[PDB]
């Protein structure tokens, strides 16, 4: 069984500077183990850089958080699931 | 400034038994401190009961998670923000 990433949104398409943003990637179906990664504009997002905060709260969940938005968090956000059976993704967008 | 709860979804309206469900309540605007509570069918959700898992990952964020869905997680999910300036909420729905 390959993975399937449910749709996700920031609850918005734009947000002010200094405000918080949060998105939730959920993979309820797909063979384990699962690789779940976040990227902004086709560049990887790492826990503890550029104001990001990644939290694998579950083997099937990966929350991304931003505590203080700025002009470098604007763009396209993607969450890619991967297992040996295949890959799956979903895309969102955000401006500031 | 009263709170404003951004729209949120489970990424779906139905899910199979034994699967995981996850929803994210975000309150990027509104005076602090903020009270954020989850309920299912107008009944409060508590961290560590009925298969639920609440995680105040932030002062402006409250993720709800379910690790093994069953026939008692079906219904209407609500996330209510509260400060001395007022309240705000958003509603989602889920069946199994």
Curated annotation (Swiss-Prot), chains A, B:
Maturation and modification: Phosphorylated on tyrosine residues in the intracellular domain. Tyrosine protein kinase Src42A and possibly Src64B are involved in this phosphorylation. Proteolytically processed, probably to generate a secreted form.
Domain Ig-like C2-type stretches: 3-96
Compartment(s): Cell membrane; Cell projection, Neuron projection; Cell projection, Axon; Perikaryon
Disruption-associated phenotype: Early larval lethal with disruption of axon pathways in the central nervous system. Dendrite arborisation is disrupted in da neurons of the peripheral nervous system, showing increased levels of overlap and fasciculation of dendrites from the same cell. RNAi-mediated knockdown in embryonic and larval hemocytes reduces their ability to phagocytose bacteria.
Cystine connections: 25-79
Domain of life assignment: Eukaryota
Tissue specificity annotation: Secreted into the hemolymph (at protein level). Expressed in brain and eye-antennal imaginal disks, including R3/R4 and R7 photoreceptor cells. Individual R3/R4 cells express between 14 and 50 randomly generated mRNAs encoding distinct isoforms.
Function according to Swiss-Prot or TrEMBL: Cell surface receptor involved in guidance and targeting of growing nerve axons. Required during Bolwig's organ differentiation for accurate and efficient targeting of photoreceptor neuron axons to their synaptic targets in the brain via the P2 intermediate target neuron. Involved in isoneural self-avoidance during dendrite arborization but not in heteroneural recognition and repulsion during tiling by related neurons of the same class. Involved in regulating axon bifurcation and divergent extension in the developing mushroom body. Essential for axon arborisation in ellipsoid body.
The protein's assembly and partners: Homodimer (via extracellular region); alternative splicing produces a potential 19,008 different ectodomains and the majority of these show strong isoform-specific homodimerization. Interacts (via cytoplasmic domain) with dock/dreadlocks (via SH2 and SH3 domains); the interaction is direct and may require Dscam1 to be phosphorylated.
Domain comment, as recorded: The ectodomain consists of 10 Ig-like domains. Ig-like domains 2, 3 and 7 are highly variable in different isoforms due to alternative splicing. Ig-like domains 1-8 are sufficient for homodimerization. Dimerization only occurs when all 3 variable Ig-like domains are identical. Intramolecular interactions between Ig-like domain pairs 1-4, 2-3 and 5-6 cause the ectodomain to adopt an S shape conformation, bringing the variable Ig-like domains 2, 3 and 7 into line to form an interaction surface. The cytoplasmic domain is required to convert the recognition and adhesion of Dscam1 molecules on opposing membranes into a repulsion signal, possibly by recruiting components of signaling pathways involved in actin cytoskeleton regulation.
Protein name: Cell adhesion molecule Dscam1
């Amino acid at each position: 069984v390959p993975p399937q990433v449910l749709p996700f949104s920031f609850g918005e398409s734009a947000a002010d500077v200094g405000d918080i943003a949060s998105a939730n990637c959920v993979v309820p179906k797909g063979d384990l183990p699962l690789e779940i990664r976040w990227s902004l504009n086709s560049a990887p997002i790492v826990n503890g850089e550029n104001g990001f905060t990644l939290v694998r709260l579950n083997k099937r969940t990966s929350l991304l958080n931003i505590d203080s938005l700025n002009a470098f968090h604007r763009g396209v956000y993607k969450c890619i699931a991967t297992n040996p059976a295949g890959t799956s993704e979903y895309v969102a967008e955000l401006q500031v």
